[PDB]
Curated annotation (Swiss-Prot):
Homodimer. Identified in NR3C1/GCR steroid receptor-chaperone complexes formed at least by NR3C1, HSP90AA1 and a variety of proteins containing TPR repeats such as FKBP4, FKBP5, PPID, PPP5C or STIP1. Forms a complex containing HSP90AA1, TSC1 and TSC2; TSC1 is required to recruit TCS2 to the complex. The closed form interacts (via the middle domain and TPR repeat-binding motif) with co-chaperone TSC1 (via C-terminus). Interacts with TOM34. Interacts with TERT; the interaction, together with PTGES3, is required for correct assembly and stabilization of the TERT holoenzyme complex. Molecular chaperone that promotes the maturation, structural maintenance and proper regulation of specific target proteins involved for instance in cell cycle control and signal transduction. Undergoes a functional cycle that is linked to its ATPase activity which is essential for its chaperone activity. This cycle probably induces conformational changes in the client proteins, thereby causing their activation. Interacts dynamically with various co-chaperones that modulate its substrate recognition, ATPase cycle and chaperone function. Changing E32A: Strong ATP-binding. Strong interaction with HSF1, HIF1A, ERBB2, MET, KEAP1 and RHOBTB2. No effect on interaction with TSC1. Belongs to the heat shock protein 90 family. The chain holds residues 16 to 224 of 732 of the full protein. The lineage of its organism: Eukaryota, Metazoa, Chordata, Craniata, Vertebrata. This is Heat shock protein HSP 90-alpha.
Length: 209
C-alpha cells in the first residue's frame, strides 16, 4: 500500500530552487544530514533520561556513513528518535514552510545555499547531489516507514517491509550520475573533517567491499 502525496507548494519551490540553481559548493549536503542525525540523537538521549525504556529499541547512539558504488547510493544512518507517519506526511512539512520562506527571502537579500541549515530545512540540500532520496525511519511510537521522493512535486510513504531498524532514521541518497565523488572514502573523510568534526556522536565511515 503506497500512498502518494503532493508537497506543499512552498516546499516544491524550495526543491526546484535546490535542483535548478547553479551552485558548485554541493558538499554541504553531508553536513546538513549529519546535523539532522545529531539533532535526532540529542532528542532520544534527552528523553531517555526520564524514561530509560525509550532505549529498549537500541542503546547505541551513533551515525554510520555507508557508500555503495554498485547501487550508487550514500546512506546516512542514525539511531536517533526517528519519525512518525505524521512527521513524514504533515508535521515536519508544516514547520518547514516558515523556514523555507525565510530562506527564500534571505537568498534574495544575498545569502547563499550553504546557509540552508540556519532555516531548519537543510534536509532538502540532499537534492544537490541525489536524484532520488529514500528515508527509512522508525519511531518508538509508530511503525517502520519508507518515505521517498524524486522531487517533481510529489512524495510517497509506505510501510517498510525490509530489515527492521530498531529505532532511528536511514537517509538513502540515490546519487546523480555526475556526483559519484561522494562515494569515495577520501572525499567523505575530507568533508566530515571540514564540516562535522565536533559532532558529539561516533561517525563510522564504512569501507566498500
Ligand atoms: O528530519 C528532520 C528534517 N526533515 C525535514 S526539514 N522535512 C521532512 C521532509 C522529509 C520527510 C520528512 C522530513 C524529511
Amino acid at each position: 500500500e503506497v500512498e502518494t502525496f503532493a508537497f506543499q507548494a512552498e516546499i516544491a519551490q524550495l526543491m526546484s530552487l535546490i535542483i535548478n540553481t547553479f551552485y558548485s559548493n554541493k558538499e554541504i549536503f553531508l553536513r546538513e544530514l549529519i546535523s539532522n542525525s545529531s539533532d535526532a540523537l540529542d532528542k532520544i538521549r534527552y528523553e531517555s533520561l526520564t524514561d530509560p525504556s525509550k532505549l529498549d529499541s537500541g542503546k547505541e547512539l551513533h551515525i554510520n556513513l555507508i557508500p555503495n558504488k554498485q547501487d550508487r547510493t550514500l546512506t546516512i544512518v542514525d539511531t536517533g528518535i526517528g519519525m512518525t507517519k505524521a512527521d513524514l506526511i504533515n508535521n515536519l512539512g508544516t514547520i518547514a514552510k516558515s523556514g523555507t520562506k525565510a530562506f527564500m527571502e534571505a537568498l534574495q537579500a544575498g545569502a547563499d545555499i550553504s546557509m540552508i541549515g540556519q532555516f531548519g530545512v537543510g534536509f532538502y540540500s540532499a537534492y544537490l547531489v541525489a536524484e532520488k532520496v529514500t528515508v527509512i525511519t522508525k519511531h518508538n511510537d509508530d511503525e517502520q516507514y519508507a518515505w521517498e521522493s524524486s522531487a517533481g512535486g510529489s512524495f510517497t510513504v509506505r510501510t517498510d517491509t525490509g530489515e527492521p531498524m530498531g529505532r532511528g532514521t536511514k537517509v538513502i541518497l540515490h546519487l546523480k550520475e555526475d556526483q559519484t565523488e561522494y562515494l569515495e572514502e577520501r572525499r567523505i573523510k575530507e568533508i566530515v573533517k571540514k564540516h562535522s568534526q565536533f559532532i558529539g556522536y561516533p561517525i563510522t565511515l564504512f569501507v566498500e567491499k
